């Protein structure tokens, strides 16, 4: 069960029709400078540390 | 120094076809489609579904031995939508990151010289 740790640089905004999910773009701690935008459910800041069971999807970024 | 193949990926709506082929094109390796991975029939073309199919074709290459592969993205073509599906690109990023060597990326979707007739009738698909 490979597990990757990602850190938040900044939070992009809130998405979803309901408005509970926020759009956050992060980077992998190990193998830095590799960054990804993913969707998170709970309250967030910068510098948060997320746990991703998978680290390979590009989430839907509202644009 | 690297053995080639042709990715021959089929970006489309409602599915995703990815399969490396020998440079001639006659001999085929690891034809895996996007519907093989999700038992929902609704995520047939979903990016995650396409991603899984690309890995297995990439994974199945090592056993054969081919290491590098040319890329040919290709939409529905013909008198159809002519625009690659959402699972179209997530497979490509999956193919490159899984280790194979990419070269000669190109678009090969068939464009007609004002072909026969498009389905939908005069007033189109009223909804």
């Amino acid at each position: 069960t490979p597990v990757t740790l990602a850190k938040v640089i900044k939070v992009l905004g809130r998405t979803g029709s309901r408005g509970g999910v926020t759009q956050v773009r992060v980077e992998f701690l190990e193998d830095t400078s590799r960054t990804i935008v993913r969707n998170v459910k709970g309250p967030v800041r910068e510098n948060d540390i997320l746990v991703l069971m998978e680290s390979e999807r590009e989430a839907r970024r509202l644009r | 120094s690297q053995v080639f193949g042709v990715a021959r990926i089929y970006a489309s709506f409602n599915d995703t076809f990815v399969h490396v082929t020998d440079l001639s094109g006659k001999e085929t390796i690891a034809r895996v489609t996007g519907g093989m991975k999700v038992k929902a029939d609704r995520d047939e073309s979903s990016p995650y579904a396409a991603m899984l199919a690309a890995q297995d074709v990439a994974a199945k290459c090592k056993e054969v031995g081919i290491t590098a592969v040319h890329v040919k993205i290709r939409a529905t073509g013909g008198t159809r939508t002519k625009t690659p599906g959402p699972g179209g690109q997530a497979a490509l990023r999956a193919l490159a990151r899984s280790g194979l060597r990419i070269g000669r990326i190109e678009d090969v979707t068939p464009v007609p010289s004002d072909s026969t007739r498009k389905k939908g009738g005069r007033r189109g698909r009223r909804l």
Partner: protein
């Protein structure tokens, strides 16, 4: 779409690659790069004769891989496997092509496209169809912004292009012509006959397709792969 296969058999395991052996494609003479790549054929049994099973393949390559210089990036080439021997199956020229991106990038509106084609035959009776394309150009100091042709230039230019293509094939058998498309000498040559008519920028010729080929004549092919 996994657990929905209602039925498999209407009337009612070995790895395929266990007997697959790689070959090598051998490009013709007038290409600096020689190792085209590899192919797959299953093992030739006593009855299958898989040696004959691959004489018909058509392999796909680009001049950038044949001349090694990105200036020929698009420059698509189709090679036809002609005869196989000693793991070094030999190919020959089948037809040139343009990439999709290049062909669409050249076509911008506010100008006039001119296209032409001919069905000349070579000295060695190879029958070829050469397509030729062009676009008009805005003269420097131009104020008006479209620069369309007068639709009698397009008639006149098309006549000149067709004569040039006929000249450049006849008297040239197959390979000098192959070594004439690589330097794009014909592209530069046509521009000599159109500047007195109209600017005609961007004269990259087009795909050229092969229609009918003469008798095999093992010897002629042997010359290419010296």
């Amino acid at each position: 779409a996994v657990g929905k296969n209602k039925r498999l058999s209407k009337g009612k395991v070995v790895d395929p690659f266990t007997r697959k052996e790689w070959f090598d494609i051998k490009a013709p003479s007038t290409f600096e790069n020689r190792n085209v790549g590899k192919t797959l054929v299953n093992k030739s049994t006593g009855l299958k004769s898989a040696s004959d099973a691959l004489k018909g393949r058509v392999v796909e390559v680009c001049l950038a891989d044949l001349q090694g210089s990105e200036d020929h990036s698009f420059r698509k080439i189709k090679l036809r496997v002609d005869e196989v021997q000693g793991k070094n199956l030999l190919t020959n020229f089948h037809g040139m092509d343009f990439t999709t991106d290049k062909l669409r990038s050249m076509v911008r509106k506010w100008q006039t496209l001119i296209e032409a084609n001919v069905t000349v035959k070579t000295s060695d009776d190879y029958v070829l169809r050469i397509f030729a394309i062009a676009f008009t150009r805005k003269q420097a100091n131009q104020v008006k912004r479209h620069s369309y042709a007068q639709s009698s230039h397009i008639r006149a230019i098309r006549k000149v292009i067709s004569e040039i293509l006929t000249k450049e094939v006849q008297g040239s058998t197959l390979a000098q012509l192959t070594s004439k498309l690589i330097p794009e000498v014909i592209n530069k040559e046509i521009e000599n006959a159109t500047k007195d008519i109209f600017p005609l920028q961007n004269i990259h010729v087009r795909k050229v397709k092969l229609l009918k080929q003469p008798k095999f004549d093992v010897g002629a092919l042997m010359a290419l792969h010296g």
